[PDB]
Amino acid sequence: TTAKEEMERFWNKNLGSNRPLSPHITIYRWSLPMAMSICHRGTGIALSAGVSLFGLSALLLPGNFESHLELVKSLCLGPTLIYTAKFGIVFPLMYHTWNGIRHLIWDLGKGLTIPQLTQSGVVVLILTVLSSVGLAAM
Amino acid sequence: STQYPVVDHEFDAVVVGAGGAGLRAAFGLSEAGFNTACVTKLFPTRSHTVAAQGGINAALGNMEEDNWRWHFYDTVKGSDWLGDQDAIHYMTEQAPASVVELENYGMPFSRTEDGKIYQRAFGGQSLKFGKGGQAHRCCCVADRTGHSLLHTLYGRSLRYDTSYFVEYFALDLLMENGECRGVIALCIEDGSIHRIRARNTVVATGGYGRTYFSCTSAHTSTGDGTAMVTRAGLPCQDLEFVQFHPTGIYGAGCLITEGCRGEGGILINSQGERFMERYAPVAKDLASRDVVSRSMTLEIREGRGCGPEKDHVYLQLHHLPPEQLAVRLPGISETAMIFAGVDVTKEPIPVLPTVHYNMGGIPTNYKGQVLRHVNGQDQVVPGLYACGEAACASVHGANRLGANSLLDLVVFGRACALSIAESCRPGDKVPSIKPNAGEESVMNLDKLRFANGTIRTSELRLSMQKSMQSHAAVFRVGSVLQEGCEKILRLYGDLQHLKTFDRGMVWNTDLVETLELQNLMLCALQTIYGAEARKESRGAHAREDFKERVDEYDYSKPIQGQQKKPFQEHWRKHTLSYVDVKTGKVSLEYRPVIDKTLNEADCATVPPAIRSY
Amino acid sequence: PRIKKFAIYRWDPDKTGDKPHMQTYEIDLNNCGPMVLDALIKIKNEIDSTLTFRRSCREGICGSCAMNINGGNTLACTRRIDTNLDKVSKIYPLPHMYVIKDLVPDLSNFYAQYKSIEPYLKKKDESQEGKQQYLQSIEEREKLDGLYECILCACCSTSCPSYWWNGDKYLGPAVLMQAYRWMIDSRDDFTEERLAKLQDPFSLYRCHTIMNCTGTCPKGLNPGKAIAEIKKMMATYKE
Amino acid sequence: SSKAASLHWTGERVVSVLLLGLLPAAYLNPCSAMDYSLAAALTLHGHWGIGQVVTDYVRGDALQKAAKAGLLALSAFTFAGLCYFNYHDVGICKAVAMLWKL
């Protein structure tokens, strides 16, 4: 028997049987590096959903951008309620931006030990809040 | 009958066991062009050669310069002259040829300045025929040698068209009129019974260390091929000879390598004295195992023990440089940190002489052929081979040398391959077996599955283990051995009273451990009765009542005027044991030791001499 | 007297309709060894001989007793019971894997993947082999450190999120680390074509450096790091 | 023998150092030429993002091409719209500016 012939036999036995899949995420321990990777996907998806909604609306919806802003302006927008709507757009961006560097550092090969992963994980989490609050006030 | 699906297979040669020796015998056959099958209860990596730490002996001469003819003298000495010199000759010459074979397979051997395989000092090995000081010929992949050995063999084995029955517990051998036809086996996955017939059968099932309460060996060291052979009515050699490794953790019995003593590790008692100086002046703490374990156990009798129970001893590694301790011995650095909780660089390791290697097993030709005893003479069992720990060509003899087993594995594994490739051809007529055969192998299996007795399986196991541990240990006497014999014999009758709880097919470990039990008891009975029968002190088997090296002559004085003893008077002979399966009573006879070499000119016979270091 | 609680995943394939449930067992710690394997053996030997599991070395060099204890994938003979008495220790079979019988998972796919990466020394000459030893300097030997020790416990790949969803086509850390192990071996000649084995988006490129493999290794190895080195070799290598 | 997954993997990192470089470059140097190069890097890096998500979760063969086809539609439509916004409107630099300062 060859290598990839044994793989064919594996599925053609298990799929046509009464064998259950062992609980995966149902019981598996939560960890920071894993939660930070889940978030990086969520932020990625959320941002592309935003950018695509900006591109599609540029073609499909009529009326210029200045008129769209005056629709927002004439909603008697709140003092901090405008800051919160702003902050909730910087927070997803700045997390994915900073952690984007952390993923990029791993591509060179640096900081791949367990302590370095946990250290830079907090560093990304912290530098985000600063760049989020800092920009929403700018 | 009719319950189990009888599935038959057709092959050229079958290998039972996928660890080291078995693995080497397997692909070596496919290399020759044989339709080879390999039956194993474990996944080949989960075999027990993986646990090996010390290394593998080969006279390559990379450290200084060596001669394989010196490696012969050392093994034939350590064997306490029970060793068959025809096998030792073949092994010591094939040694560099089998190791360079492994390095060329990809075994990541530790390296030197030249870029050559790193050898190192080990228990009882000497240059210039035991005259030129300590020898350094133990090749090693830094403390995880048997791990690399098993991996690089297995890795190289996928390069051939061998069939592997992974997790298939071999029940009994297939036998028809003195000849072996293959093996009957139980699938652990679905529970179906498979009969695998072939022209030849190699047996490499390893030792039966699980006969004792305290051992270094894995939970799956149950000497099954040893039992398979005895159920066929075939003899078993040197079974009373059991190696007690001096260094094993006080807890579960985890092995710390003898490479500790080989690199610079020193063994210390309660008073603080290096107790391996008054016992052994020349070789000292790096002497033979039957001298070190003999000393350690005897030191506890004095009351010079260590710990809250006064039963264990210490091994110093504190003084060693951290520079080489983390490099040469990182595997024991981690495993002594877990079970003992001991900083390997600052604090000494707690050790204890525990059961380790099985010197005896299945009587084996120097070419790997299984032997039987007919009319005082030797006889080849047709279509049957054995290599490794389960085998007893008795290349190790009364006491095995440090790191000589992994050699016994590869060399005799290769031998088992060559001797099949030379004697017969692949595609030759596979002998037909009776459609009714393997009849009571099913009956034995089916009774153990349905067992509705009174005595629990685990509770009968520990009864054997403690009865062996106390009665037949390092030191043993005819008073305690006699009691132990009738203790084990009466226990064999208790096997018909056992209670099993699992009534299932898929992965019935409850059933396979009971099959392990039956295969352990048979290995236990012959060991205990063999110990009682032998009334001398030769290597590992030490008698406090018969502390005598009983040879043909007294080899201290020159043999000239002395008259020779008859065969049934001296003890320099192999113990051959049989067991009747129903009654359980052990009938045992004897056969002579091979003292001739392969070629006298190329390698001279070494006569019996003084036994000390 | 000192009691500890264990909750274990149970599934019997013999009784039809028997859906996976949990069963509790209680054992005194003074009568038991420190490790989880000692506990499993004790309830196997005394309380219920219907519990099934793979075990061998009890030394932490097989990968037999590899399971999910308390949310993590390690060895049962290496990891010790939490002496905390009130808390119940949960033991499960390795995650997202087909269960043959309770705690015993099917590894046929896992082993077959290790076969497909060709884990043996390959040369141009097979004629001059077996007779002379290959030369390798201590530095070239040092590059194998932290890679040869892998025991194939499969705690690694069974913890990888990509290996869960893509168990079929993606190899996983353990297997990939070994593929790397044969690349940096100075003796090996087939390094360039070993990399060519992974030119599809699934073989290697499902690893997004999530990093659960290294954080679960019972032997302390760093497979994730090795994957990044493969990636590095994949973009740099010549021809 | 061709190495498609090798060169593609490098490309993602090349746009990643471009996109990371462009964000401060858009702030410090806000221009018309910056607006288009930003929209290109945004949509491309995003297209090679969801492309990886599809290959991960989307199980199937006929399904696999459908999601990839549909993803290319939105990717093209997003990039077309962002180009249209840069030509016939204010520009994405000023879009943020008028959104932030006002």
Ligand SMILES: *Cc1cc2c(cc1C)nc1c(=O)[nH]c(=O)nc-1n2C[C@H](O)[C@H](O)[C@H](O)COP(=O)(O)OP(=O)(O)OC[C@H]1O[C@@H](n2cnc3c(N)ncnc32)[C@H](O)[C@@H]1O
């Ligand atoms: C116990 C031990 C031994 C040891 C060592 C450390 C320990 C803890 N370190 C060594 C070292 O550093 N250097 C050295 O030279 N030797 C060392 N040893 C001794 C040596 O490793 C052993 O002699 C060796 O492991 C024996 O190997 P063998 O080829 O005889 O086979 P195995 O490894 O014991 O594995 C047994 C195989 O047989 C199959 N099997 C057994 N029963 C069945 C049944 N019922 N049905 C089907 N298959 C069966 C198993 O599958 C297994 O593969």
Ligand code: HEM
């Ligand atoms: C300039 C800062 C950014 C950098 C450096 C960056 C880089 C990265 C990296 C390294 C990944 C993960 C790839 C991996 O290593 O596995 C990723 C994911 C992703 N990015 Fe960004 N990114 C940035 C901002 C953005 C922006 C502005 C968008 C636009 C929507 C975006 C869209 C996405 C998407 C959709 C993913 C999904 C890939 C995944 O999570 O598997 N990113 N990015």
Ligand SMILES: Cc1ccccc1C(=O)Nc1cccc(OC(C)C)c1
């Ligand atoms: C495939 C992938 C790539 C990058 C980042 C995350 C994932 C992913 O799906 N992980 C995943 C998905 C669901 C649950 C989960 O566990 C949590 C319960 C800890 C992990």
Ligand code: SF4
């Ligand atoms: S690299 Fe470590 S965690 Fe992965 S399979 Fe090997 S021993 Fe297990």
Ligand code: F3S
């Ligand atoms: S858990 Fe994972 S996706 Fe990569 S870093 Fe390890 S294989």
Ligand code: FES
């Ligand atoms: S049994 Fe060998 S790893 Fe636990």
